[PDB]
């Protein structure tokens, strides 16, 4: 999930965009 | 875990901005 | 639209807190 | 939507819960 | 009132920052 | 009130110190 | 401590949201 | 303290109501 | 003006995110 | 400035990017 | 890096408030 | 920079002022 993906290692805007609808 | 909770608070804000009119799915 | 944008930012933070582990869809 | 529902008159926590998964 | 709600949110943040270890009351 | 004082014209940080303990 | 500072910031927000018209004290 | 209680394991909103007036 | 002040607070956060390692210039 | 540009009318990500270094 | 990112978010909000009309450069 | 200066030990408001324009 987003916490696993983005809270230990940093997420780019593209990676954040994954969670958009 | 509190560090994850604080992280998630920023993540929601980032999604809000990034996703714009598409909106987003927050699943913790 | 700016006022709506500002309000939404606060709404998604509120949803983050109220919804907790269940998460939420934000679909504007 | 939530914006039109909640951005003029304040939504209670209970009303906001309606948008949870 | 959503405007007061949004203003307050920022006020509490500001108070948290300026008040330091003293702390504050928010009792609108 | 802090709302009357500070939501209708900008309060400085200096002014806001008035509301500290 | 920056960790406590950051945690507190989120706590005050949460208190502002949950406490409503009652308000709150943050007096760490 | 609220810091001892809530910065080291997550406090629910219900728990945080304890710190309201 | 308070509406501008609240807007600016969100603008800073958006710049923070958008600009990444470039950073930004906030001039009000 | 950014307030004039982005607080009466809404700014896209591209428009926000203008203010990046 | 995530902790640094979270901290920076709060720093730029603080700078927004402390610096006021003068503004600031955030250059990480 | 400000991050390395201020993200472990808390920076006072005065220290943060050093980064204003
Ligand atoms: C923008 C952001 C916030 C929190 C964690 C991340 O990886 C990215
Ligand atoms: C908590 C919250 C934030 C923004 C709008 C609302 O109606 C309620
Ligand atoms: C810092 C701040 C927030 C909200 C209103 C104000 O006048 C000042
Ligand atoms: C809502 C919130 C913020 C910070 C710490 C917590 O345990 C809970
Ligand atoms: C992202 C954002 C915040 C505030 C105003 C804007 O136009 C855009
Ligand atoms: C006010 C503030 C926020 C984040 C880090 C700091 O040192 C100080
Ligand atoms: Cl944080
Ligand atoms: Cl706002
Ligand atoms: Na997606
Ligand atoms: Na630029
Ligand atoms: Zn934070
Ligand atoms: Zn706001």
Describe what you observe in this structure.
The PDB classes it as hormone. Keywords: insulin NPH like crystal, hormone. The assembly is dodecameric. The complex is a heterododecamer, with four copies of chain A (21 residues), six copies of chain B (28 residues) and two copies of chain D (21 residues). Chain A has 21 residues and is mainly alpha-helical. Chain A is built from two helices and no strands. In chain A, 48% of the residues lie in helices and 0% in strands. Chain A starts with a helix and ends with a helix. Chain B has 28 residues and is mainly α. Chain B has one domain. Helices cover 64% and strands 11% of the residues of chain B. Chain D starts with a helix and ends with a helix. With 21 residues, chain D is mainly alpha-helical. Chains B and C meet through helix 1 and strand 1 of B and helix 1 and strand 1 of C. One zinc ion sits at the interface of chains B and G.
Write out key terms for the chains shown.
heterododecamer, B: 64% helix, D: 21 residues, mainly alpha, 2 helices, 0% strand, flat, binds M-cresol, binds chloride ion, binds sodium ion, hormone, insulin NPH like crystal
Largest interface, counted by CB within 8 Å of the partner chain's CB: B-C, 14 and 15 residues
Helix fraction of chain D by DSSP (H/I, runs of at least 4): 40-55%
Assembly classification: heterododecamer
Helix and strand content put the structural class of chain D at mainly alpha
For the report, how would you describe the main beta sheet of chain D?
none
Ends distance of chain D: 15 Å
Radius of gyration of chain A: 8 Å
Could you tell me the radius of gyration of chain D in angstroms?
Answer: 8 Å
Overall form of chain D: flat
- Helical residue percent of chain A? 40-55%
* Shape category of chain A: flat
With helices defined by DSSP (H or I, 4 residues minimum), what is the helix count of chain A? 2
Main sheet characteristics of chain A: none
Number of helical segments of chain D?
Answer: 2
**Ends distance of chain A:** 15 Å
What is the H/E string of chain A?
HH
- The proportion of strand residues of chain D reads under 5%
Number of strands of chain A: 0
Q: What is the number of strand segments of chain D? A: 0
PDB class: hormone
Keywords: insulin NPH like crystal, hormone
Assembly: dodecameric
Entry title: Structure of human insulin cocrystallized with protamine and urea
